[PDB]
Design an enzyme around this catalytic site. Structure first.
Site, PDB file in Angstrom:
ATOM      1  N   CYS A  10      50.280  47.494  44.766  1.00 16.31           N
ATOM      2  CA  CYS A  10      50.423  48.062  46.108  1.00 16.31           C
ATOM      3  C   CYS A  10      49.561  47.314  47.127  1.00 16.31           C
ATOM      4  O   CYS A  10      49.162  46.171  46.892  1.00 16.31           O
ATOM      5  CB  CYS A  10      50.066  49.544  46.091  1.00 16.31           C
ATOM      6  SG  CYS A  10      48.452  49.790  45.377  1.00 16.31           S
ATOM      7  N   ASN A  13      45.135  48.801  46.184  1.00 19.88           N
ATOM      8  CA  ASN A  13      44.732  49.287  44.842  1.00 19.88           C
ATOM      9  C   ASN A  13      43.730  50.430  45.035  1.00 19.88           C
ATOM     10  O   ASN A  13      42.585  50.368  44.560  1.00 19.88           O
ATOM     11  CB  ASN A  13      44.107  48.147  44.014  1.00 19.88           C
ATOM     12  CG  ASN A  13      43.933  48.508  42.536  1.00 19.88           C
ATOM     13  OD1 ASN A  13      43.116  47.882  41.841  1.00 19.88           O
ATOM     14  ND2 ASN A  13      44.719  49.453  42.040  1.00 19.88           N
ATOM     15  N   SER A  36      46.272  47.613  37.349  1.00 17.53           N
ATOM     16  CA  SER A  36      46.644  47.893  38.720  1.00 17.53           C
ATOM     17  C   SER A  36      45.966  46.930  39.661  1.00 17.53           C
ATOM     18  O   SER A  36      44.807  46.552  39.456  1.00 17.53           O
ATOM     19  CB  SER A  36      46.355  49.341  39.096  1.00 17.53           C
ATOM     20  OG  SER A  36      44.972  49.607  39.188  1.00 17.53           O
ATOM     21  N   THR A  63      38.261  49.748  38.918  1.00 16.65           N
ATOM     22  CA  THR A  63      37.906  48.829  39.987  1.00 16.65           C
ATOM     23  C   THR A  63      39.150  48.593  40.838  1.00 16.65           C
ATOM     24  O   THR A  63      40.277  48.801  40.374  1.00 16.65           O
ATOM     25  CB  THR A  63      37.386  47.467  39.447  1.00 16.65           C
ATOM     26  OG1 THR A  63      38.283  46.961  38.454  1.00 16.65           O
ATOM     27  CG2 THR A  63      35.982  47.611  38.848  1.00 16.65           C
ATOM     28  N   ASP A  65      41.223  45.922  42.344  1.00 19.39           N
ATOM     29  CA  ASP A  65      41.451  44.509  42.074  1.00 19.39           C
ATOM     30  C   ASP A  65      42.582  43.848  42.846  1.00 19.39           C
ATOM     31  O   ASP A  65      43.539  44.506  43.257  1.00 19.39           O
ATOM     32  CB  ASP A  65      41.743  44.294  40.584  1.00 19.39           C
ATOM     33  CG  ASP A  65      40.736  44.977  39.679  1.00 19.39           C
ATOM     34  OD1 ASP A  65      39.528  44.845  39.943  1.00 19.39           O
ATOM     35  OD2 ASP A  65      41.171  45.652  38.726  1.00 19.39           O
ATOM     36  N   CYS A  82      54.092  50.231  46.808  1.00 23.74           N
ATOM     37  CA  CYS A  82      54.037  49.954  48.240  1.00 23.74           C
ATOM     38  C   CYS A  82      55.447  50.016  48.761  1.00 23.74           C
ATOM     39  O   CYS A  82      56.342  49.291  48.282  1.00 23.74           O
ATOM     40  CB  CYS A  82      53.476  48.554  48.507  1.00 23.74           C
ATOM     41  SG  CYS A  82      53.026  48.266  50.259  1.00 23.74           S
ATOM     42  N   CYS A  89      53.125  45.007  52.224  1.00 25.37           N
ATOM     43  CA  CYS A  89      53.578  45.125  50.838  1.00 25.37           C
ATOM     44  C   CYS A  89      53.672  43.778  50.115  1.00 25.37           C
ATOM     45  O   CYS A  89      54.199  42.809  50.668  1.00 25.37           O
ATOM     46  CB  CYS A  89      54.909  45.877  50.765  1.00 25.37           C
ATOM     47  SG  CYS A  89      54.751  47.645  51.180  1.00 25.37           S
TER      48      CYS A  89
END
Ligand SMILES: [K+]
Length: 131
Positions: A10, A13, A36, A63, A65, A82, A89
């Site tokens: 997305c 994150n 993710s 975290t 990332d 997203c 996006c």
């Protein structure tokens, strides 16, 4: 057999992807790498941490990332959270197995919106596992 990899991506994150990573680890299990990432890193949304704590899932060690090309190209499935027309996006490379899972952005909303989205993501991942 070998581990399969799912990647929730997305904008930052921050919330949807973090709750998805939290649910993904619990539901999919150790036979899956559940990652993710975002085009930007906004940190893990505090309300997303609180929403997961309510369902006994600890995401406080997660975290925020940035997108890694070697995880995209080697993933079994990349799930975009997203919204395709919304704002900022991530652009996905060709031939990479992808799906768009649409959930409302809980950013700046009350905790109830995080609870709603958390639960929609729960069911989506539970159904995914049973495909
Ligand atoms: K992450």
């Amino acid at each position: 057999m070998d581990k399969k990899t799912i990647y929730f991506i997305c904008t930052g994150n921050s919330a949807r992807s973090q709750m998805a990573e939290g649910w993904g680890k619990e539901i999919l299990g150790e036979g899956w790498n559940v990652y993710s990432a975002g085009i930007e890193t906004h940190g893990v949304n505090p309300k997303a941490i609180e929403a997961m704590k309510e369902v006994d899932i600890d995401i406080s060690n997660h975290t925020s990332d940035l997108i890694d090309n070697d995880i995209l190209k080697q993933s079994d499935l990349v799930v975009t959270l997203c919204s395709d027309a919304d704002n900022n996006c991530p652009i996905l490379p060709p031939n990479v197995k992808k799906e768009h899972w649409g959930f409302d952005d809980p950013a700046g909303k009350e905790w109830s919106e995080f609870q709603r989205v958390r639960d929609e993501i729960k069911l989506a991942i539970e159904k995914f596992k049973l495909r």
